[PDB]
Amino acid sequence: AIAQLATEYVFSDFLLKEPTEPKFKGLRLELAVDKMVTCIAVGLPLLLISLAFAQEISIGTQISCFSPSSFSWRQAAFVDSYCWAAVQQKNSLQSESGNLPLWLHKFFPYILLLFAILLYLPPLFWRFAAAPHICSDLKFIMEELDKVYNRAIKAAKSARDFKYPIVEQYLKTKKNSNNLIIKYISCRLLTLIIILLACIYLGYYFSLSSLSDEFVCSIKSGILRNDSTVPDQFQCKLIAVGIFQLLSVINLVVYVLLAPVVVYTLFVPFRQKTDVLKVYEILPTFDVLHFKSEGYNDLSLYNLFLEENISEVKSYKCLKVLENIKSSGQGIDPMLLLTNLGMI
């Protein structure tokens, strides 16, 4: 039913499932905006496919040819099925709009499924190629941040009663390499191109005259070519073509609204803001150097992933509340850190 399709595709965790494995425990591995874009671009065409053939919206068979009254039920059924299979056969049918509109009307669900698969492909390539590496690197970075926070609080407590910036060096090294950012931009660009092509197709499909679904059909090949009792042609109409056009314009609207989001996503350096690591600069055990901005490198992408999935880090949360309290400046950062006692 329509409501069942809605529950499956919008109100359920459709493509929102976290990786089912212990390797990525709590790691999104995909930005929220990218996940939203993929979920829409994939589950919208599927939802429209399901809707267009819902038991309520669908009168019945997808084509009716209006055989003569003399024709029996199965003769008329032969006519309808023959014309359905003959939309491909150009000789059999003669339609003013041509045969491409008939092909599109017959295979619209296939085309929507193709667009959905093509849009799901780049996210899958990301999740299967560049996701494990970033997952491992980000897990190491979070562990290093937790360890340095613990060491700093232990030092502060000892004072009240190595020291090498490994994480900073690793981030600096990531500043050079750009394979991950190149893959990310390539997959986003392919998604954008697929969306644009889908928009072109949907606009063309919705621009039809709405009468191209009606085509003339001739069961006059073979032994029936010279038969007399059979009329030379029939009036066939492809039902649900109006529904297809409505859903196609809906998908076109959604995709044109979505494309600016993908374009904004492509410009990762601009998105790289609100320095996540700036909060850690007040730790004595952490060097006061952010050095993450203004670069078409994997460093900006790692900064984005950190700003996305750093809320799960207790040390980061503690430092963030310390920073927020520092806005008033009533107290002292080391005193607040010592009082917090948030090692684990």
Next chain:
Amino acid sequence: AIAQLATEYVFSDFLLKEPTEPKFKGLRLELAVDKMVTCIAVGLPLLLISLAFAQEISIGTQISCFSPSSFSWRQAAFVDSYCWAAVQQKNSLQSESGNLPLWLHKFFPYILLLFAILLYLPPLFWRFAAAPHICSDLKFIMEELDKVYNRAIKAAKSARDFKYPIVEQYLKTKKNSNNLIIKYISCRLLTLIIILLACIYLGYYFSLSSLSDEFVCSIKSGILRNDSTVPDQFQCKLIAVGIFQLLSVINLVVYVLLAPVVVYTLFVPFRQKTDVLKVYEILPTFDVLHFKSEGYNDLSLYNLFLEENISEVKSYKCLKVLENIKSSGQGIDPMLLLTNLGMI
């Protein structure tokens, strides 16, 4: 069946499922009133869609055109399907009420699903954008309250046998920022606007003459335009239109009753009452300062979320019972706190 739909949509945890993740363990992340509003506004139109096409209420096909007796079964089926697809084609049909009523009668389930999706969108945006931040902040606040309660009871026990207000400073800082409250008000306002538009549409749909479902249909395009055996027109009726109007007025009543709730929700500062933190003011380790009221800021929203999901805090419950006992004034707050022995 009707009962199955009821069990799924009203008697089950439809959209009442808690976040399936360890990040939010026991945190609602959504006020009870907001959750009720979203659940109604989403699962009502879906329930009505399912009901309108229930196997019992539905006689059968959604349109019947009453072809002549001479017409065969599949000729009549062609007529019915053609008219169903031609509700869009204005030339084919001539109805007194126009063609918009026919469009609405055909696509009412789609319109209800659209309203449900549009009403579910703002809650989803909230849960995916502003929910993680408030979850982390509120978890930190609850942990700080538990820790300060433990410290105060330990101090009392030591007396019987830092001290910095970090949580108060954090709340004071939240008094300034307003991004969360702005997002909350924006999503509530969008929900209200969607509800009002849905009410307008449902009122228009229910105001129809009830005879607009009957339209005249002409299969007279193409080779059949000059055919003689076919009548110039047919009498088609869209079944289930009365059911659609009944369910639409039901939804209109529900939404007009719900809109005052959304308006009351918009005025969060008025809702900010019954100070949750007032109970903690009797703790020696906690400063006697509430400072949370009369502000279009995130502080009021945090106060609401605390008053919502603070019952899970054992320290808060203990302080609440101490406060309630203090109404009589027979005993002493520190003595009762020491006797409680409710560290964990």
Next chain:
Amino acid sequence: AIAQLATEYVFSDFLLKEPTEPKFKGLRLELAVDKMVTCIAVGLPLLLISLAFAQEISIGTQISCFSPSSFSWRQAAFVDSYCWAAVQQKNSLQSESGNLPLWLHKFFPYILLLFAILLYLPPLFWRFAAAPHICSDLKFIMEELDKVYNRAIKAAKSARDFKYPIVEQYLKTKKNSNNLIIKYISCRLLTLIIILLACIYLGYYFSLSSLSDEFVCSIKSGILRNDSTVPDQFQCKLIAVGIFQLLSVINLVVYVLLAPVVVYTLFVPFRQKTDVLKVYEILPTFDVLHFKSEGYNDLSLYNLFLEENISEVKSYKCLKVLENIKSSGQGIDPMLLLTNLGMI
């Protein structure tokens, strides 16, 4: 099937599911009588809806109009569907009993579902508004009782080899407030009113002549108004109306039997008997004062909830067996308590 519906709605845990959350572990949060009343009042109309359209009891379509023999199958189907949709349209049909009986016959499942939803609403309001508070308070009370029992047995063992009545003070304070009892009485009263209205409706529906299901139908609007081959009217009958009346009288009987139960529930103070706390009065560490009776206050409701869900408390069970043994008076209460050794 009928047996499947029975298993789902009477032999299964339909609305008998305990709260699926760790917050309420073993707490009913709903009295047994109230749960029975809600389960009946909700799952009876749903069961009757399912039964009335069971594949065995149902001959087929819900209306047959007996078109002339000259009419084709789909002409007759048009007639039947038109009349089904025209029960609303007063002009189309002319029935002796009127049009309200036809409306009721068509929408009886909807009306039963409406009554079920309206009866499920007050229980849901209770469980979502006043259940968390009573759950927290009752959990605290049980924990306090366990702690005082442990302290008393420890003192007895020490003798053989604070002391403040916090729980008693909390109960005394609850004696004043009445918001929970007011909400309980309001929800019970609304349930009673809904049940009475349902009884009125079912009595009216069952009082019909049983021939109102037969109505005269006229497909004579539009181009067919002046058509000659079509008869001026048809004889239509709404099938399953007898089944609807039978199930409606069954529901009426059940609801009239249930209403006295709801009225008895409304009088909570009378139900407040068999003092649960009287057993704890023999503990040296517990003050000898019950002070819970004769009040339209939340104290009586808390006493009811205690008498309901106190069997899970080991200390209460031990004190109950001590009390029962004290009926003979052969031994001594402190000696029996010491011998029991039931700390945990």
Next chain:
Amino acid sequence: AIAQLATEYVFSDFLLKEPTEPKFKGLRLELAVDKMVTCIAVGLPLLLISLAFAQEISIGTQISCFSPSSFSWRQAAFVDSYCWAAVQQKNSLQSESGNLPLWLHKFFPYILLLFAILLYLPPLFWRFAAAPHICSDLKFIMEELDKVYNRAIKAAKSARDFKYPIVEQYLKTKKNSNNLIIKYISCRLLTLIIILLACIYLGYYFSLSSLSDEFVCSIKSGILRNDSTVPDQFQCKLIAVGIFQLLSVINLVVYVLLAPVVVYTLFVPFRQKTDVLKVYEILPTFDVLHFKSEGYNDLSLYNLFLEENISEVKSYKCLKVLENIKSSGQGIDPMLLLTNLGMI
């Protein structure tokens, strides 16, 4: 399918599910004979309902009226559905056996479901009212038996290298109260009465002439009353009536065989034999006094429940093997108990 129904209702744990809660861990809370009686009396009529309308045994529709050849398919369908709905309407039909046989033939599944529900009601009342109390009491009794066994074995080991009969006093007190036994006897008696009424009904239904399923039907009310082309009456037959009678006699046989079991159950004191507590009399720490027999009191019912669900007690099992070995008398009870070393 038939085999699926059999698997669900006889070969599966239909109504044999243990209470899904930690409160009753391993406690039957229902005697084996009572559970068997309830399972049969409930799942037999449901199984017969399912069988009577199985896709294999069922030819098709439940009534056929044999309309004239001139009648079209949907005219004949109208006739059949009209007569199906008119079995209630006495004026419409004229049958030699009357109208009650037709009512019974139409609503036999409803009557079987009613009997099943009425037979399931007393067991449900027991499980929801008197089951928690007996569960708690019996758990306490088992814990006391385990503790006294442990104390006795510890004393024996100490000798080789309070003392109050709390459980005996509790059982003696149970000797007085009789509310549980009264509820048990009342529910068993109601089950017996329901079974007898079901037997009466099934005997009456099976005693029919087998031709009462054939009734004369007249679609001659309304505009068709004076119509000429329609015959004055039709020959309608209610299919599956023979299957209903066969299954009804099967159920009658099962219930008459079952009723003696219920009568034997009612006489609980006679069932109270094979003293379970007699084995514990050899323990030095346990007083040598059974005092459980010859009483219409809850003590006999508790003895039955003990004899039912005491096999789970390791101490009871050990004492039972000691008793069995004592039949030969080769050894000594205290020596065997010491050698067993079965504390836990």
